[PDB]
Symmetry: C3
Subunit: 101 residues, 3 copies
């Protein structure tokens, strides 16, 4: 009913399928390796861009501090100019008085 | 030829058990890969948001720079106008005696 | 023992079915992951170019900051000289109004 030869036939049949499965596994292993390599590189570049952006952001915060400080200085100078104006007018108007006399 | 059948069966059983074990390892490797990809996607979006915040702040700094530069030119102008008024007063006093 | 041999081969066949099902799912997921990584690479590069532009603008803001700082110091210098010139005229006018 079941000859050694029929069994042999099944074995060669199973062996042929396994050959195909193994070749497919080889193709997939290669794709997984390449993908791991791509991910590793993206990780590295992402960390690098994070560091670069970190430096920019740190400069930006300094620029914020600086802008606040310069504004404060401009306000102070403006204040000094207005005070001088009061003083100049005092001298101007007094000269008007003397000159007319 | 019973021996040759048993030998071949043994090799096949051996080979498929290895193939199965390998497939399991590959399943595992791919799920680890999915996790790593999900992680980089997440970190990229976070960095994108962080940069967007920085770029937003930078535009404000541009705006603030324009305003300050205008204020400085204006204060300069006032100072020059006062210079002229002071010179007139100096000249007049030198002349008043 | 032919049936015991065929039983072992039936089990081998079931294992092959399971591996092949897994291989199909693995191929579907692998293509998806490869697409996802490609998208990450592209978006990362875009973010890098965008940051490059931001970094350039910041370097310009730094020079603007230096420039304006220099102008404020020059203006303040003139305000201080004018203060001395005004004091000069003030003190003399007060002198003249004495006696
Ligand atoms: Cl006078």
């Amino acid at each position: 009913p079941v000859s050694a030869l029929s069994i042999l036939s099944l074995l060669e049949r199973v062996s042929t399928i396994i050959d195909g499965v193994q070749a497919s596994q080889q193709r997939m292993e290669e794709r997984q390796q390449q993908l791991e390599g791509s991910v590793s590189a993206v990780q590295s570049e992402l960390l690098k861009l994070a560091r670069d952006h970190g430096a920019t952001a740190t400069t930006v915060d300094k620029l914020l501090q600086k802008a606040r400080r310069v504004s404060t200085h401009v306000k102070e100078v403006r204040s000094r100019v207005e005070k001088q104006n009061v003083r100049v007018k005092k001298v101007e108007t007094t000269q008007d008085e003397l000159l007319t006399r």
